[PDB]
Amino acid sequence: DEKKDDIKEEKQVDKKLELRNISNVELYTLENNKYRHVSSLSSVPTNPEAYFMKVKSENFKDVMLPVKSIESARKDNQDVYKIVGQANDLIQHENNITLENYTYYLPKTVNSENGVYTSFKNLVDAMNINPYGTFRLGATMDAREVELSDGQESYINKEFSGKLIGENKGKYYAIYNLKKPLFKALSHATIQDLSIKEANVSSKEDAATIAKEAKNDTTIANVHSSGVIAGERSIGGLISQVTDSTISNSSFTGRITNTYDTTATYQIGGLVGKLSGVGALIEKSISSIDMATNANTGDQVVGGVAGVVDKKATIRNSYVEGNLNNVKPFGKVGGVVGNLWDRETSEVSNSGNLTNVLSDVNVTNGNAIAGYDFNGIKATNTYSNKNNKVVKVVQVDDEVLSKDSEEQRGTVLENNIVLEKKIELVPKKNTKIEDFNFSSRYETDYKNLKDADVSRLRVYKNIEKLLPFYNRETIVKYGNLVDANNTLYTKDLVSVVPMKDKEVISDINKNKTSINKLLLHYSDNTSQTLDIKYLQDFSKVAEYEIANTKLIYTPNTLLHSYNNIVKAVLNDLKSVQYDSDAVRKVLDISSNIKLTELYLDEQFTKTKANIEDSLSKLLSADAVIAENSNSIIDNYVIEKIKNNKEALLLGLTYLERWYNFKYDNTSAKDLVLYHLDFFGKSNSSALDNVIELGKSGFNNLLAKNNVITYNVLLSKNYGTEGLFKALEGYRKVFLPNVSNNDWFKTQSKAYIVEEKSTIPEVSSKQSKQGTEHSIGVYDRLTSPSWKYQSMVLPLLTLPEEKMIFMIANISTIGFGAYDRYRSSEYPKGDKLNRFVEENAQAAAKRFRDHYDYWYKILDKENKEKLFRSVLVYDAFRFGNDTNKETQEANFETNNPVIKNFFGPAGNNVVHNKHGAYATGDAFYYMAYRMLDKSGAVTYTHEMTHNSDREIYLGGYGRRSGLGPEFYAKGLLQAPDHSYDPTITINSVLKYDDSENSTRLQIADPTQRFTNVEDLHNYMHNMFDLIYTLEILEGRAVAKLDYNEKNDLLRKIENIYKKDPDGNSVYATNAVRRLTSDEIKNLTSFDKLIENDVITRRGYIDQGEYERNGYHTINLFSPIYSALSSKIGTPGDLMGRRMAFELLAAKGYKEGMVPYISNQYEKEAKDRGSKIRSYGKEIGLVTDDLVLEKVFNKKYGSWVEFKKDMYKERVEQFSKLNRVSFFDPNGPWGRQKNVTVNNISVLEKMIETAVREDAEDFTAQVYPDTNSRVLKLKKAIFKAYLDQTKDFRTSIFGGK
């Protein structure tokens, strides 16, 4: 019945190892017992084969394989060498023909004449043999080919040096990865069109990229440099010391750093360290520098573009666009030139010369153009920008300042900068030879291969990540077997093998044990873990079948045996010591400098004890070695490790110390040290990365510079953009769907507390992980506008879990230490912990309350400016268990808090003697403690210092004469205690039923102030009572006799002294005794206001007051005076009193902001009241202008305003007063109820108290205890403040 019909089936394919993607191959040798590169140096067919090939690639890492034979042949009648590699079952494809082994053709020497163009080793050897001559470049050429040193300080170490080094044969070329000065001496040369791209030079001597010196007419031209530079005794962007040389049209774009405290002369500059010739010039030159220096003495001259400029050396049409940053203002620091003045006996006729020089620097602790300003300055032209020229000047609290050595210009720089219109060149990248890829884009058949589907090119390019080292036919087969619905149809980055979230690298060690998982990382940043089981014992390349996809997976390693290498180099790797001289040789360091700032004292022995496993994993992830029995490549690997053992161990220690955190049980040291291909960029190798990090030098390995080191050295080996972007990428792949702030808080061992404000709207704003409004500490530590970004890595890598507590809030983030509150009453365990945790929560709540009050009070969209981040350190005065003492322990100390934090965070505290001080963008608790109750009030004080100029005021700066401590102590800082009889506003503290006797303040600021108008009502009612009491006492002291009036009353007065600027307009209050005629004038209450009378009871001063002083105004001591400084600033006592009176009368924004916050500067300038302060033409706001603006024309003088306020209070109270005043007024034998019902009783009692305190004068050290008037006023104030809830009403009206 059935008729047999055949079925034609597809044919099965043979699988072989193949190298599809190839960039360029390199041949090595063992000719002189050391492994050296050979580049066409093979001139004859070599007799024996001790060579080996290193086939680089751009898809994955290189594949070192030995050489089977060498023969001379011709591919196209040109003499080439048939270098044939070798592998177990390798295969090579050429025009659809399978060759048994990999063969490339190495041509002999090229005919390129008139210059050595090949490679860096050839170039430097030629220039060493023949210093004269012309040496162009033929290709973009890297500088790590040269072994870089025996003890030398430069690549070319001859005086004469590359007299004509062009770098444009037909197109411009570049030199990569420089590590030392290029020439060490330059004399009569004509360097031209060179372009160094990534230079990392570090020399204890004078350090610069293209040369150390320039003796004769060396015409540098079009030489563009870049990269980081670190020096110790001089620095130069291109040349450290030029004489008689014209560095024209060059540039420099990188970082420069000399932060050592050496007491020696150095001339560091971003372009040239010193010009010292009559014919020296710098023309059409740019300098994008990021310099962080430390001058410390008037001889070290940081210099921006150029350092010392001497003997009529010019700076023409130059330009600098960076961020210079000195530490101390002592040395001569300049934005453009550090010193224009001669070092010999200097006549002005031989000074430096500038012309058409701009400066877009954010220079700190230095001038803006020239560091040294003198009478005969010779700039003759210079421009600038509106940027930060901060110079840290020291008051009792530090603060910013300007320098005023500048010619100012607006923001037309985007046009003024492009006078030299050249913007672009085209430096070529490193060249490649070929690509033996099988999939050719041209279509001989509509299918590229035999079985190649045009719809699945992305599937093939994803399979090429799953299956490296496999023939192209098997690649297309497994591409065709990919399921249609499978998610391998999207772009794929490289995959990793976790083994149940462990990220294994040693595949030879762990192939037998099934790799239980396989993490696929996609371009969408989405991840996907697959299950894989070790399928087939293909020992060359381990094969893992995916669970149910029918595909396979082969890890990118050949399961090579590293036992020989490990046992060979372990002995020489374990005989390395941190304090040895070898470490001081691998680090380009002197003998005076100490290795404390590395903070790798313990991790060094940790990674030296555990060196074998990490070394095996590093070799496994380094490269690919294809051998069975010979050791021609193992010897090369052991030589590479042995020659760089110190650098290897230092890089390994650094990367293990600062990257110990984990993403959900997957350590990040594995993903950082190993698996460089996690973000793409599989070209890189782990061992070379670790080596080049180790050789980076002392400055790059420094603990403070972890983020910068990553960004400028560790990046472009991983493919990332920055350190925090890399951490975010790792968090996106491992542990997804969790905000990175939550990951940081669950990884960091610091006790982080974040208090979101109680207002619903701001809480909703903060609870969103989108930055610029978030409260999360990680969203602010990693964001720009945060100076110390190197805080993140130490915070993640914290050892002991009880050493640091972190208080974060709106507009602040504060760091502390458990060991600060340690004492004999609080030992190390289970008591200090609970105390610090509870007090940290309480202090965070108090700080949140403070900024909640200020967020309510601010109205003119300044509340949007309350989202800043100002750090708050603690004392560093760590305690001990035995005594209740403290040790400062700045740095250099073995306290684990200092070593694990506060040291890696590169912040050094000045360590003043008492109190707390503010820096203007930071805040430190020297004597007070952040977790105490007084910590809140001092925090308020110094935050009013920090946020005075911009946030608390309407953005208008402080007034002309008012100092930083005019605002804090008397106006905006919360009172020290509850019972303080001072006119302040309670913001932070909250009293609980125990201070309710002698309270005299607001107990609940979170419930009292709910708007600006609530603050205005509170102040208006408090001043209603204050004015009532002042009226009552004034109407008594006016009805009084001669001597006792003279005793009770004193006259305040304004005396003007010369401010250390040019002006003498700012007033200073002075309390003096008053004359007989003035006393005889005092016959009523109005005359007390007229004659400037003050009360001696409270303000015990009898002499002049002081500017910038901690003065406060008492509630009960009357100041009958209305003192107006028609000349200028009013003073520090009457200033506070008038500010509070204006806050009582007018609102906070309409009054007391105009009075104290320079708001009418524009109108003062328009009306002619202009002055000159520190060379700046600034308006002067006389108090009469303030009165005219706050109140339109109602009041003509402050005396009239004061008398009108008193008249309003009088007309209110003379008829209506609350009966509820029930003060007892006596401790023993008291009157049970005064029961004040009409103001006659209050007036009679106040008059009796004043009359009985005029006689029996106190006049002693104790005027507050023994005075009856103060007791009566305090009793009345407390009774009224108790009657009303706080200050909602004092005289009910309407009926």
Numbering used by the authors: 907 to 2201
Authors' text:
Many invasive bacteria block the initial mucosal host response during colonization by cleaving host immunoglobulin A1 (IgA1) via a bacterially encoded IgA1 protease (IgA1P). Third, all M26 metallo-IgA1Ps comprise the M26 region itself that is responsible for IgA1 cleavage, which corresponds to G. haemolysans IgA1P residues 907-2201.
We solved the structure of the G. haemolysans IgA1P catalytic region, G. haemolysans IgA1P residues 907-2201, through cryo-EM single particle reconstruction. In regard to similarities that exclude the NTD2 gating domain described further below, the G. haemolysans IgA1P NTD1, MD, and CTD superimpose well with their analogous domains within the S. pneumoniae IgA1P with an RMSD of 1.1 Å over all Cα. The most striking difference between the two substrate-free IgA1Ps is that the G. haemolysans IgA1P NTD2 gating domain is shifted to a more open position by ~6 Å relative to that of S. pneumoniae IgA1P. However, this partial opening does not give any measurable advantage in binding affinity described above for the G. haemolysans IgA1P inactive mutant over that of its S. pneumoniae IgA1P counterpart.
